[PDB]
Design an enzyme around this catalytic site. Structure first.
Site, PDB file in Angstrom:
ATOM      1  CE  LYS A  51      -3.466  66.809  97.967  1.00 18.86           C
ATOM      2  NZ  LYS A  51      -4.757  67.195  98.624  1.00 18.86           N
ATOM      3  CE  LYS A  63       2.414  61.227  87.146  1.00 18.03           C
ATOM      4  NZ  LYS A  63       2.599  60.615  88.501  1.00 18.03           N
ATOM      5  CB  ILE A  97      -6.760  49.426  66.338  1.00 20.12           C
ATOM      6  CG1 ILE A  97      -6.799  49.019  64.863  1.00 20.12           C
ATOM      7  CG2 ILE A  97      -5.678  48.612  67.042  1.00 20.12           C
ATOM      8  CD1 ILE A  97      -5.418  49.159  64.187  1.00 20.12           C
ATOM      9  CB  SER A 171     -18.461  69.139  69.737  1.00 20.91           C
ATOM     10  OG  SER A 171     -18.362  68.671  68.398  1.00 20.91           O
ATOM     11  NE  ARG A 174     -19.745  70.106  74.397  1.00 20.71           N
ATOM     12  CZ  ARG A 174     -19.365  68.987  73.791  1.00 20.71           C
ATOM     13  NH1 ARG A 174     -20.233  67.996  73.608  1.00 20.71           N
ATOM     14  NH2 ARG A 174     -18.117  68.858  73.362  1.00 20.71           N
ATOM     15  N   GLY A 180     -15.104  66.996  66.019  1.00 15.07           N
ATOM     16  CA  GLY A 180     -14.420  65.794  65.583  1.00 15.07           C
ATOM     17  C   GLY A 180     -15.237  64.970  64.607  1.00 15.07           C
ATOM     18  CG  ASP A 183     -22.032  63.059  67.567  1.00 11.62           C
ATOM     19  OD1 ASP A 183     -21.684  61.906  67.286  1.00 11.62           O
ATOM     20  OD2 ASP A 183     -21.259  63.926  67.990  1.00 11.62           O
TER      21      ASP A 183
END
Ligand SMILES: O=c1ccn([C@H]2C[C@H](O)[C@@H](COP(=O)(O)NP(=O)(O)OP(=O)(O)O)O2)c(=O)[nH]1
Ligand SMILES: [Cl-]
Ligand SMILES: [Cl-]
Ligand SMILES: [Cl-]
Ligand SMILES: [Cl-]
Ligand SMILES: [Cl-]
Ligand SMILES: [Cl-]
Ligand SMILES: [Mg+2]
Ligand SMILES: [Mg+2]
Ligand code: NA
Ligand code: NA
Length: 326
Positions: A51, A63, A97, A171, A174, A180, A183
């Site tokens: 926190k 949590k 979707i 990515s 970087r 994934g 680009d």
DNA sequence: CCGACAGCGCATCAGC
DNA sequence: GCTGATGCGC
DNA sequence: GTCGG
């Protein structure tokens, strides 16, 4: 991955809130907490310690205490058991979707891969391609393949017009060891903020990549953005490579630095950086950095000659792409 | 407490 | 057809 | 869900 268990939990909660609850701000809050915790250099011992980090509040602290004590979260345990939540979370893994379509499909009792496949006529174009390559799009891309892919793209673009510049961002820029997708940022001197002296600049590149069978499918295509599918060529008797997602963005050449800053990311780094700009009284998009007036109206674009210029305006020390993976 | 949460391109739809 | 709102994803 | 003012 000092805190892999916690970041995973937060990510699952984020996905629940986006996909099921359609609570986009809760989704973003959770991703922010996961991100700040992911970079925290200590194994977290309690929710109170977490926190302390910005973006971790009272709820997430509780949590983390549950998760730490038990290794799990009852809230997630229940969600995992809920058929409707499970079905919606699943369907949203198909490109095209989203939360809305997923819930509509489930309403019609279309809720498995099998169901989608038998009801292909109920899918828009994007969704069909996402279904077609569902498995493939789940696989990551090794950097070594990314290098091969870069070679092709850069060389085929040079073949179309030697004045194009193509830069692989995301990515990959970087320094990630896997990505994934790919680009690609594209510029050409004909297209500036001042004029478009040549049409079909993006079309032409897409066409060449299709011609050589690199680009295999299209998810969307306009004058400045292409979203689609590509595949490396395989050798004799070799199993084919998986199909990969590719995104291309044509940016005015004079606006290259804001463009490469945007397409380099990460998404969360951009959200952080843009938020800070606002606090400093600027607004940043992929094209420009502009001052905000006393009214809040964005002024005229400030002179930019490097990525670092952008950082300087907002009083941030420069961060190399490799240090922007948030 | 409560407003604000980054910023935008392309596909699809309603309403006219 | 257009403009504007919404969904999806970058 | 979290935060600044
Ligand atoms: O919500 C977003 C998403 C992406 N972007 C940016 C930054 C990002 O790095 C870039 C490419 O989008 P990707 O979805 O391809 N993410 P990235 O390349 O960083 O990681 P990966 O593709 O390996 O999952 O566009 C945003 O600015 N906002
Ligand atoms: Cl929300
Ligand atoms: Cl859990
Ligand atoms: Cl719940
Ligand atoms: Cl490159
Ligand atoms: Cl702009
Ligand atoms: Cl770097
Ligand atoms: Mg990417
Ligand atoms: Mg991408
Ligand atoms: Na905090
Ligand atoms: Na999806």
């Amino acid at each position: 991955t000092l805190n892999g268990g916690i970041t995973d939990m937060l990510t699952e909660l984020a996905n629940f809130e986006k996909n099921v609850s359609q609570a986009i701000h809760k989704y973003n809050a959770y991703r922010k907490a996961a991100s700040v915790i992911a970079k925290y250099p200590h194994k977290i011992k309690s929710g109170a310690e977490a926190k302390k980090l910005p973006g971790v509040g009272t709820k997430i602290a509780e949590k983390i205490d549950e998760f730490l004590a038990t290794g799990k979260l009852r809230k997630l345990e229940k969600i995992r058991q809920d058929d409707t939540s499970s079905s919606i979370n699943f369907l949203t893994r198909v490109s095209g979707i989203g939360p809305s379509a997923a819930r509509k499909f489930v309403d019609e009792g279309i809720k498995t891969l099998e169901d989608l496949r038998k009801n292909e006529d109920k899918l828009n174009h994007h969704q069909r391609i996402g279904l077609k390559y569902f498995g493939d799009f789940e696989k990551r891309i090794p950097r070594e393949e990314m290098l091969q892919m870069q070679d092709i793209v850069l060389n085929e673009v040079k073949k179309v017009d030697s004045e194009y510049i193509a830069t692989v961002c995301g990515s990959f820029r970087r320094g990630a060891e896997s990505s994934g997708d790919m680009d690609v940022l594209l510029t050409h001197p004909s297209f500036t903020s001042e004029s478009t002296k040549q049409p079909k600049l993006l079309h032409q590149v897409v066409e060449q990549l299709q011609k050589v069978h690199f680009i295999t499918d299209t998810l969307s295509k306009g004058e400045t953005k292409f979203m689609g599918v590509c595949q490396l060529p395989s050798k004799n008797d070799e199993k084919e490579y998986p199909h990969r997602r590719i995104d291309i963005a044509l940016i005015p050449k004079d606006q290259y630095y804001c463009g490469v800053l945007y397409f380099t990311g990460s998404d969360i780094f951009n959200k952080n950086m843009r938020a800070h700009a606002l606090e400093k009284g600027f607004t940043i998009n992929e094209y420009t950095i502009r001052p905000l007036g006393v009214t809040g109206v964005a002024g005229e674009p400030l002179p930019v000659d490097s990525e670092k210029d952008i950082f300087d305006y907002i009083q941030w020390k420069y961060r190399e792409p490799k240090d922007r993976s948030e």
